[PDB]
Structure 1
Amino acid sequence: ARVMTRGEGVYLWDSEGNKIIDGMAGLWCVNVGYGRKDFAEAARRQMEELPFYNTFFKTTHPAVVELSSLLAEVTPAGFDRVFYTNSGSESVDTMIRMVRRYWDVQGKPEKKTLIGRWNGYHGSTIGGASLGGMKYMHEQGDLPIPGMAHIEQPWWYKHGKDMTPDEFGVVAARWLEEKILEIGADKVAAFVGEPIQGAGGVIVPPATYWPEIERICRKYDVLLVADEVICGFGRTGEWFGHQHFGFQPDLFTAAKGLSSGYLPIGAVFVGKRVAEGLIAGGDFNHGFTYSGHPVCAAVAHANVAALRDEGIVQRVKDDIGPYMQKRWRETFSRFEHVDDVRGVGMVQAFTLVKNKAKRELFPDFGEIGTLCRDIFFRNNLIMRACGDHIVSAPPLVMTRAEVDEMLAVAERCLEEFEQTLKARGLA
């Protein structure tokens, strides 16, 4: 009977008048928060004026031109080429086609294999699911399609053995070199990864990881792609997660965080090297020119402008981010069954564990996470479980009072969670 009635800021309300804290910002994407009535006006105006632009005209729709110009002001130097899509999933599928076409154009038609990671998520298309490494997605299908390979994820809690996180980062990155050499560098087109793995559980790699991944890609002349599905548009305090981790990808993909989810959209941001190679090839020219639904572009422009002009991204970096990260660690580090408390900017997580001292996970990874999640939900807090990882990505506009409000509810729920563990003898 429970229906959602409205949203404002970080809150949702139901038909019974109950306030719900959205600690996940819809699908990790409602970065400016709920209730942006100004976006509705942007959509209305664009649709009344010119919701279409026909290819009969050799020019680009002014709404799309304006969006691309704003994006160029906020994206790293050298990403003047943007190919618009309808979603993060389509962005990934397009990027796969682009990376393969680039090598064809270069006269290296064998260079077609993309390398991803286990527990990596890259959307839901046949191609994206194949690049992804989600156990259940490959489990129930014909995946992966040819020319896809996977390396283990940089999850220190599980795989670190006796290494420090920094030592482990180097070893985890070197799995890419090992895989490139196993396949043959001349068969490898790209490595693709989320700066922080989102759906996998907010797996935050060690500081040593991305620099070594980047060194390895450059050494073997393999393209480097960041999937900014979740880290894009201010989530880490930088505009894009790759900026936080300090690597410089050749292309990066974006999902509906581009519009804070208010209309469906995505994009592939294409760097100078690949853009020039594809422009010589010619078969993405239609897309580079005529991609982007004008009404969706108008909403995304309003959203990106708000992110910049209202100082929202800067505020994550300098203000609410450090506050959230400190408070997050203060709140959860004391629990007997919580470990690997982690996060940066406005994405954060922890893992529910059987025994901290032994780094021992619960068996049937996910059962305990579901149990904890159900408690959060009963208490009108949205934070999700990915296996036994608990994850949070609230709207970036969250105030310190709202941070503290959310944490107080979560803290109460964790106390309940541990009581239920003990009472069922699983502790």
Structure 2
Amino acid sequence: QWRELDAATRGEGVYLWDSEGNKIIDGMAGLWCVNVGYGRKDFAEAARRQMEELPFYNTFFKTTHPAVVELSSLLAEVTPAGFDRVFYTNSGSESVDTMIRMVRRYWDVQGKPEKKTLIGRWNGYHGSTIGGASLGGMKYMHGDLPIPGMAHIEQPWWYKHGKDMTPDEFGVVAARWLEEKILEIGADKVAAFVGEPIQGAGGVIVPPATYWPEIERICRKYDVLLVADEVICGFGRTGEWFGHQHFGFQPDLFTAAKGLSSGYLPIGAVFVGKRVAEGLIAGGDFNHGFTYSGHPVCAAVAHANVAALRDEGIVQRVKDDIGPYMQKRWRETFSRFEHVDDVRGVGMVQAFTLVKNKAKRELFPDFGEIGTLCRDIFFRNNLIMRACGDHIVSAPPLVMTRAEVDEMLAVAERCLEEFEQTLKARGLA
């Protein structure tokens, strides 16, 4: 009946439940976002409390809503220095859209109305808004997109574009693709470069260690703003509070998604560095949001989420305990298989790639076909892992226990033992 109306039961910890009684291991944590796992009844209480006390705070008053002030203050403590001014929204997509406007408007204030082009990457994802889909580098997205002033460079995907280079060597090369694009367009027309510290929807593409430092060198060289999209890597996913902290680059601003509330309520934000912030304040355009922005109820729940991620040592636990454990076990489990390679990951994000031949580094034809097939197995065994093309990705709730990790891998191991079984059964060597 539910399927019928749709076409026209529970969650707790890292587990989900169906009406058939079967438990389900959610290795995706909703949409990369449910970082503290499900069943957080103190979040529900924080939401109720706020929706019964003050669910609104109107412009009429000089001040701003307490819960927002309280959230802004807590976030300042967990975010790196120079990000006191935050701009709240309802989603990561809206975050990206907003920062696209802030980026262009900033240069206007700086008396450089030519600097409007943002450079993204192919296979990069930055939301579903028109501007967001334009900044992204997905094909099946490209509403007459992209909009003007949007350019793209190739992604740091060593396995495919690495040739005979070492990852670190390929990191420099891949990063200098940006320099090439900048000189092609003209630095005076380039406003910013935007990238996920790790490409999420693109199949968890982890760039070499040399990549981001080189991207930053180039940005600073040509006076191009550096923007990180923490949509997925945000809030402990890599072990650090933010992806750009792990890879060691400092963006002028960055975008966050509902991971900020572990997906319990819709919310997002753009964190604006001092340099850019003073530019926007000098303009006066986004001053209304730096003050009045943020839905009270969502702020309250988001506050409790952040407070929990820090106070309960969930984030620190990813960097010290469960992260290193997940990476070692992930690599121990998937390195045996004949059609699995490029096993990768950091903190609580992992992935690998289904391949025809590991020796040749030969990918399967019709990139995506074999991935979906492997996904179907995962879904028959009540294990949720996502297939981005022929990439299998993982991103469970950060509070997952070592025991729960082994359990998940145990199931995943079966699925692949079967995957290669079906593979050879269909004649796909």
- Normalising by structure 1, report the TM-score: 0.98
1:312-353 Cα offsets, whole Å, 9 max, x none, are: 000000000000000000000010000000000000000000
Q: Secondary structure at the match of 1:46?
A: helix
1:408 Cα deviation from its structure 2 partner = 0.3
Q: CA deviation at 1:426?
A: 1.2
Shift, 1:17, TM fit: 1.2
Counterpart CA distance in 2 for 1:192 and 1:412 is 39
Tell me by how many angstroms 1:240 deviates.
Answer: 0.3
Indicate the residue corresponding to 1:266 in structure 2.
268
> How much has 1:363 moved relative to structure 2?
0.5
- In structure 1, the residue matched to 2:166 is 164
Deviations 1:68-93 (A, max 9, x none): 10000000000000000000000000
Distance in structure 2 (CA, Å) of the matches to 1:75 and 1:135: 34
Superposed CA deviations along residues 300-322 of structure 1, whole A, max 9, x for unmatched, are: 00000000001000000000000
Aligned residue for 1:310? Answer: 312
How far did residue 63 of structure 1 move? 0.4
**Which secondary structure state, in structure 1, belongs to the residue aligned with residue 141 of structure 2?**
helix
- Indicate the residue corresponding to 1:230 in structure 2: 232
Residue 371 (structure 2) aligns with: 369
CA distance in 2: counterparts of 1:16 and 1:161, whole angstroms: 49
SS at match of 2:367: coil
Query: Match of 1:308, SS?
Result: helix
The Cα shift of 1:59 comes to 1.2
Tell whether 2:73 aligns with 1:69.
Answer: yes
The percentage of aligned residue pairs carrying the same residue is 100
User: In the alignment, which of 393, 397, 400 is matched to residue 399 of structure 2?
Assistant: 397
TM-superposed CA distance for 1:132, in Å, is 0.2
1:88 aligns with 2:92: yes
RMSD: 0.4
Q: Corresponding residue for 2:359? A: 357
State the distance in 1 between where 2:287 and 2:17 align: 45
What secondary structure does 2:112 align onto? coil
CA–CA distance in structure 2, aligned partners of residues 344 and 313 of structure 1: 13
- Runs of 4+ off more than 2 Å: none
Aligned residue for 2:407, secondary structure, equals helix
SS at match of 2:126: coil
Alignment partner of 1:103: what SS? helix
Cα deviation, 1:156-185, whole Å, max 9, x if unaligned, reads: 000000100000000000000000000000
Looking at structure 2, the residues matched to 131 and 326 of structure 1 have their Cα atoms a distance apart, in angstroms, of 34
**Alpha-carbon offset, residue 135 of structure 1:** 1.5
1:291 counterpart = 2:288? no
Aligned mates of 2:260, 2:296 — CA distance in 1: 14
Rounded Cα–Cα distance in structure 2 between residues aligned with 1:362 and 1:351: 10
Give the match for residue 111 of structure 2. Answer: 107
The size of the alignment, in residue pairs, is: 421
| Pairwise CA distance, 1:402 | 0.2
Shift of 1:409: 0.2
Q: Deviations over 1:239-260 (max 9, x none)?
A: 0000000000000000000000
Q: Which runs of 5+ in 1 are unaligned?
A: none
Equivalent position SS for 1:426:
coil
TM-score normalised by the chain length of structure 2: 0.98
Please state how far the C-alpha of 1:273 moved relative to its aligned partner: 0.3
SS of 2:11's partner is strand
Match of 1:382 in 2: 384
Question: Could you list the per-position Cα deviations for residues 89-145 of structure 1 after superposition, in whole angstroms to 9, with x for gaps in the alignment?
Answer: 00000000000000000000000000000000000000000000011111xx30000
Q: CA deviation at 1:357?
A: 0.2
Partners of 1:48 and 1:12 lie apart in 2 by 29
Rounded Cα–Cα distance in structure 2 between residues aligned with 1:134 and 1:68: 33
- Distance in 1, matches of 2:62 and 2:113, equals 32
Secondary structure of the corresponding residue to residue 137 of structure 1: coil
Q: What does the per-residue CA deviation read over 1:254-313, in whole Å, with 9 as the maximum and x for residues that have no partner? A: 000000000000000000000000000001011111110000000000000000001000
Q: Deviations over 1:172-213 (max 9, x none)?
A: 000000000000000000000000000000000000000000
Using the TM superposition, give the Cα deviation of residue 355 of structure 1 relative to its aligned residue in structure 2, in angstroms: 0.1
Q: 1:58 deviation in Å?
A: 1.8
Secondary structure at the counterpart of residue 136 of structure 1: coil
Mapping of residues 45-194 of structure 1, within 5 Å: 45-138=49-142, 141-194=143-196
Deviations 1:210-232 (A, max 9, x none): 00000000000000000001000
1:264 is paired with a residue whose SS is coil
TM superposition shift of 1:415: 0.6
